[PDB]
Scaffold this motif. Structure first.
Motif, PDB file in Angstrom:
ATOM      1  N   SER A 136     -48.919 -16.363  35.793  1.00  0.00           N
ATOM      2  CA  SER A 136     -47.760 -16.656  35.003  1.00  0.00           C
ATOM      3  C   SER A 136     -47.659 -18.152  34.973  1.00  0.00           C
ATOM      4  O   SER A 136     -46.972 -18.736  34.110  1.00  0.00           O
ATOM      5  CB  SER A 136     -46.549 -16.076  35.706  1.00  0.00           C
ATOM      6  OG  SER A 136     -46.799 -15.938  37.098  1.00  0.00           O
ATOM      7  N   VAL A 187     -49.817 -23.950  39.186  1.00  0.00           N
ATOM      8  CA  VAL A 187     -49.470 -25.214  38.562  1.00  0.00           C
ATOM      9  C   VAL A 187     -48.243 -25.790  39.232  1.00  0.00           C
ATOM     10  O   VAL A 187     -48.348 -26.621  40.125  1.00  0.00           O
ATOM     11  CB  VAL A 187     -49.130 -24.992  37.108  1.00  0.00           C
ATOM     12  CG1 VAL A 187     -49.034 -26.279  36.378  1.00  0.00           C
ATOM     13  CG2 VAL A 187     -50.154 -24.062  36.490  1.00  0.00           C
ATOM     14  N   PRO A 196     -47.335 -16.812  30.479  1.00  0.00           N
ATOM     15  CA  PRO A 196     -48.306 -17.641  29.724  1.00  0.00           C
ATOM     16  C   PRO A 196     -49.054 -16.991  28.568  1.00  0.00           C
ATOM     17  O   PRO A 196     -49.363 -15.788  28.601  1.00  0.00           O
ATOM     18  CB  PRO A 196     -49.325 -18.077  30.770  1.00  0.00           C
ATOM     19  CG  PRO A 196     -48.903 -17.465  32.070  1.00  0.00           C
ATOM     20  CD  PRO A 196     -47.733 -16.572  31.868  1.00  0.00           C
TER      21      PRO A 196
HETATM   22  N1  LIG Z   1     -49.119 -23.056  30.532  1.00  0.00           N
HETATM   23  C1  LIG Z   1     -50.282 -22.430  30.615  1.00  0.00           C
HETATM   24  N2  LIG Z   1     -50.939 -22.028  29.487  1.00  0.00           N
HETATM   25  C2  LIG Z   1     -52.181 -21.462  29.581  1.00  0.00           C
HETATM   26  N3  LIG Z   1     -52.774 -21.289  30.803  1.00  0.00           N
HETATM   27  C3  LIG Z   1     -52.135 -21.684  31.909  1.00  0.00           C
HETATM   28  C4  LIG Z   1     -50.885 -22.258  31.832  1.00  0.00           C
HETATM   29  N4  LIG Z   1     -50.481 -22.539  33.075  1.00  0.00           N
HETATM   30  C5  LIG Z   1     -51.452 -22.163  33.939  1.00  0.00           C
HETATM   31  N5  LIG Z   1     -52.481 -21.620  33.224  1.00  0.00           N
HETATM   32  C6  LIG Z   1     -53.748 -21.077  33.740  1.00  0.00           C
HETATM   33  O1  LIG Z   1     -53.762 -19.654  33.677  1.00  0.00           O
HETATM   34  C7  LIG Z   1     -53.949 -19.088  34.950  1.00  0.00           C
HETATM   35  C8  LIG Z   1     -52.557 -18.927  35.538  1.00  0.00           C
HETATM   36  O2  LIG Z   1     -52.548 -18.547  36.884  1.00  0.00           O
HETATM   37  P1  LIG Z   1     -52.193 -19.650  37.946  1.00  0.00           P
HETATM   38  O3  LIG Z   1     -51.731 -20.860  37.219  1.00  0.00           O
HETATM   39  O4  LIG Z   1     -53.507 -19.882  38.739  1.00  0.00           O
HETATM   40  O5  LIG Z   1     -50.970 -19.151  38.882  1.00  0.00           O
HETATM   41  P2  LIG Z   1     -50.648 -17.630  39.305  1.00  0.00           P
HETATM   42  O6  LIG Z   1     -51.845 -16.661  39.228  1.00  0.00           O
HETATM   43  O7  LIG Z   1     -50.165 -17.603  40.697  1.00  0.00           O
HETATM   44  O8  LIG Z   1     -49.535 -17.175  38.370  1.00  0.00           O
HETATM   45  C9  LIG Z   1     -54.695 -20.192  35.641  1.00  0.00           C
HETATM   46  O9  LIG Z   1     -55.970 -20.203  35.053  1.00  0.00           O
HETATM   47  C10 LIG Z   1     -53.986 -21.430  35.187  1.00  0.00           C
HETATM   48  O10 LIG Z   1     -54.878 -22.499  35.291  1.00  0.00           O
END
Ligand SMILES: Nc1ncnc2c1ncn2[C@@H]1O[C@H](COP(=O)(O)OP(=O)(O)O)[C@@H](O)[C@H]1O
Ligand SMILES: [Mg+2]
Length: 729
Positions: free
Chosen positions: A394, A398, A537
């Motif tokens: 989600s 980040v 996202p």
């Molecule tokens: N705003 C965004 N738009 C598109 N992709 C994103 C965005 N923010 C994070 N991502 C990417 O998408 C995936 C999101 O998961 P992550 O950021 O690793 O946190 P989590 O799995 O804990 O929610 C990762 O590949 C991240 O790099």
DNA sequence: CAGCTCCATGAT
DNA sequence: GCAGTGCTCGCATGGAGCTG
DNA sequence: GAGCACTGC
């Protein structure tokens, strides 16, 4: 839909409460002189036979009727003047105030002290977890059958337990083959209505024991007696005067041995007794504030109410109580944090503006908020215990990282915590390659690391510019130092503490993969000042979830042969029934790459195994121990939960989560057995629930919090606020 | 596959 | 502790969804 | 009649 819709229907007019009721609905909207006048015509029931209640009322109904012949103001004070009195009325009349005495005896007896109970019942009763007696109160009814309301004879609604009245003149008993028949019949005056008994003769006696009087009969109706005219079976025919059997009366869990009529007379004879003995719990200053009964009466009410209003007032008291217990312990924590105090600091848009523009993708107005919130709370003169909550993928991560700059950027240093060495190593990589660098030195300190290196590190922290340490709850167990530490990030459930710099509080932040709806948030945790929850996202496509019958199970099996042949991987989860091993090499008739993980055999180098799964050693897996939200096997295209719903509607999510990553457009089937509607009613719902909070919404509304054990509150929430306010001290 | 409960039926 | 009154409440079976 | 309270030996 039958039942779920009929008693419901013929359940509005005709009983003080209902009356009072409506009238309140009356005003909260608009009188209707006309109406009232017709409700009063339909009233029937023993409560009414009180003089004042009758007098008290007129006065009232008299005051109200004036509304309409009344302009604006003329209407108001008029109204609230009322409303006040209803509740005023309700409180007066509607409750069976347990006037007490003799004197309390008060423990946990092995229940034989119980009256009516004896040896065998002793054992019987303990099949229900009823030892003690406290055991015999905390044990409230299944439900309630009501009665108060009596049906006329010749209006029997085909197919329904009703309670009618009348004399009785007719005791015939009929023998056939492998069956007798006992009959007596009831005579309003005009009508005469068969009332029939099967394999009971005794009844013979009583009924004869009776012929004479008019009575109250409580049974069901039957569309047969093919001769015609309905026949009433199974009833109870109590002699009467029943102002006192025109009541609500409970329904308890049973256990071959006992009967309601049994279990009942047994609560009938003790509860009043026990109830009486209970040292009040919350202070009288409260009570008065919100208006629902001490205890005695409340516990009283859960068994023997005479107004559903009672019962309401009883849970309500009985439930606030137990939320209190929580919100108490909460502030009682939240306050202790106010002592030790926190620390703030200033912040350079510098970093983030940078970080943010560095990335490829957008960001969300959600994560944005995550952001505006954290900063600020860190910044604030005190601690931060936020919860960064979201749904695998989600953008939780980040965000954490901004926390990490901002804090570093400030002055102090942060310290990432994570359940597993394998997960530490792995996280580390990201925070750095992620941090892709700038200028921050981040470590790990995991015991794998060589003793020196440890040293070079430790010391690195005791003083200077080791900016973040990545590790397990390994840190805290050896005793590290650094005299500035501005925050602590966390991932999830670490087995089984807070941190203080000099003496102030450490900005704490905890991320979680498994949502929780706000009420439950604010009610079992609350103390986590917030939870900046995520809304998801883009580019992000989601699991085509499917639900598959059994038989066709070898169907999915194959689908993998494919996807897995095209280079992907497949989980396979099988709850509990060894078969596993039988489930295993019969599953190496799926000959091809398989690995097991029995599960609660639970070394939490489970990841030990997943790593090895994600690396490509067990082409496919084999569950038991619902795998957790952890190391992430990339190639894993497809998932397969079997004979489910034993799994909460959440572990399944867990599971769905675990398979997708990449874009991978992963997939997850779920073999089913038979079970049904309510069961599959749910699954069906799962599969189309794009969103895992409306999941919790949905897990709550259906099964109470499976995720020791709440006695009473099935989401109404005015309580959870009634809390905050009264709930400081 | 088992052990229990709860509900509905049983008669010319 | 067992032996004698005197209460209240007492069918039985079969398919049924539920948990272990 | 099962189960239990209560009274007496
Ligand atoms: N705003 C965004 N738009 C598109 N992709 C994103 C965005 N923010 C994070 N991502 C990417 O998408 C995936 C999101 O998961 P992550 O950021 O690793 O946190 P989590 O799995 O804990 O929610 C990762 O590949 C991240 O790099
Ligand atoms: Mg994460």
């Amino acid at each position: 839909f039958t039942s779920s819709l009929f008693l419901w229907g013929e359940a509005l007019p005709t009983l003080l409460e209902e009356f009072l009721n409506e009238v309140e609905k009356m005003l909260k909207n608009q009188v209707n002189t006309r109406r009232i006048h017709q409700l009063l015509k339909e009233l029937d029931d023993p409560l009414l036979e009180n003089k004042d209640l009758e007098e008290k009322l007129q006065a009232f109904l008299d005051y109200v009727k004036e509304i309409p012949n009344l302009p604006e103001a003329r209407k108001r004070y008029r109204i609230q003047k009322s409303l006040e009195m209803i509740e005023k009325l309700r409180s007066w009349f509607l409750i069976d105030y347990l006037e007490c005495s003799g004197e309390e005896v008060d423990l946990s007896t092995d229940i034989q002290y119980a009256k009516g109970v004896g040896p065998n019942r002793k054992k019987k009763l303990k099949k229900l977890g009823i030892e003690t007696l406290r055991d015999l109160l905390e044990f409230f009814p299944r439900d309630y059958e009501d009665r108060r309301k009596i049906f006329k004879l010749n209006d029997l609604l085909p197919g329904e337990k009703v309670t009618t009245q009348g004399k009785i003149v007719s005791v015939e008993t009929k023998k056939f083959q492998n069956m007798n028949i006992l009959t007596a019949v009831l005579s309003d005056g005009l009508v005469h209505v068969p009332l029939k008994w099967f394999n009971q003769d005794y009844l013979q006696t009583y009924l004869k024991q009776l012929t004479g009087k008019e009575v109250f009969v409580t049974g069901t109706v039957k569309s047969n007696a093919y001769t015609g005219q309905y026949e009433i079976h199974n009833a109870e025919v109590t002699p009467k005067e029943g102002e006192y059997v025109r009541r609500i009366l409970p329904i308890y869990r049973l256990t071959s041995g006992i009967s309601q009529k049994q279990m009942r007379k047994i609560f009938e004879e003790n509860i009043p007794s026990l109830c009486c003995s209970l040292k009040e719990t919350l202070p009288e200053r409260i009570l008065e504030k919100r208006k629902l009964l001490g205890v005695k009466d409340a516990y009283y009410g859960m068994h023997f109410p005479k107004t559903f209003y009672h019962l309401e007032k009883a849970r309500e008291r009985l439930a606030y109580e137990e939320l209190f217990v929580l919100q108490l312990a909460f502030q009682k924590i939240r306050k202790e944090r106010e002592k030790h105090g926190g620390i703030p600091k200033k912040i350079e848009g510098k970093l983030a503006e940078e970080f943010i523009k560095s990335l490829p993708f957008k960001l969300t107005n959600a994560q944005k908020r995550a952001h505006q919130e954290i900063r600020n709370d860190m910044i604030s003169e005190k601690p931060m215990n936020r919860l960064l909550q979201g749904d695998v993928g989600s953008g939780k991560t980040v965000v954490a990282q901004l926390a990490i700059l901002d804090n570093y950027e400030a002055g102090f240093q942060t310290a990432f915590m994570v359940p597993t060495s394998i997960l530490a190593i792995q996280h580390y990589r990201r925070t750095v390659e992620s941090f892709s660098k700038f200028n921050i030195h981040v470590a790990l300190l995991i015991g794998a690391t060589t003793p020196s290196e440890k040293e070079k590190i430790k010391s690195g922290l005791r003083n200077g510019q080791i900016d973040v340490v990545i590790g397990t709850h390994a840190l805290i167990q050896e005793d590290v130092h650094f005299k500035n530490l501005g925050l602590v990030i966390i991932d999830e459930q670490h087995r089984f503490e807070a941190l203080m710099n000099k003496g102030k509080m450490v900005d704490t932040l905890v991320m979680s993969a498994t949502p929780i709806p706000r009420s439950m948030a604010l009610a079992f945790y609350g103390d986590l000042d917030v939870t900046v929850i995520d809304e998801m996202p883009p580019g992000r496509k989601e699991v085509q979830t499917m639900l598959v019958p059994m038989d066709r199970v070898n169907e999915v099996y194959e689908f993998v042969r494919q996807e897995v042949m095209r280079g992907g991987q497949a989980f396979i989860v099988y709850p509990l029934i060894k078969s596993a091993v039988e489930m295993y090499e019969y599953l190496s008739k799926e000959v091809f790459k398989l690995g097991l993980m029995h599960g609660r055999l639970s070394q939490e180098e489970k990841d030990r195994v997943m790593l090895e799964f994600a690396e490509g050693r067990y082409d496919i897996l084999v569950s038991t121990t619902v795998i957790e939200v952890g190391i992430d096997v990339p190639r894993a295209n497809v998932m397969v939960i079997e004979n489910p719903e034993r799994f909460g509607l959440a572990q399944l999510h867990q599971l769905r989560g675990r398979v997708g990553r990449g874009g991978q457009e992963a997939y997850c089937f779920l073999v089913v057995g038979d079970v049904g509607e309510e069961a599959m009613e749910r699954l069906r719902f799962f599969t189309l629930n794009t969103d895992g909070f409306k999941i919790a919404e949905y897990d709550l509304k259906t099964r109470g919090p499976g995720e020791k054990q709440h006695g009473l509150s099935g989401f109404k929430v005015a309580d959870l606020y009634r809390d905050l306010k009264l709930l400081e001290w």
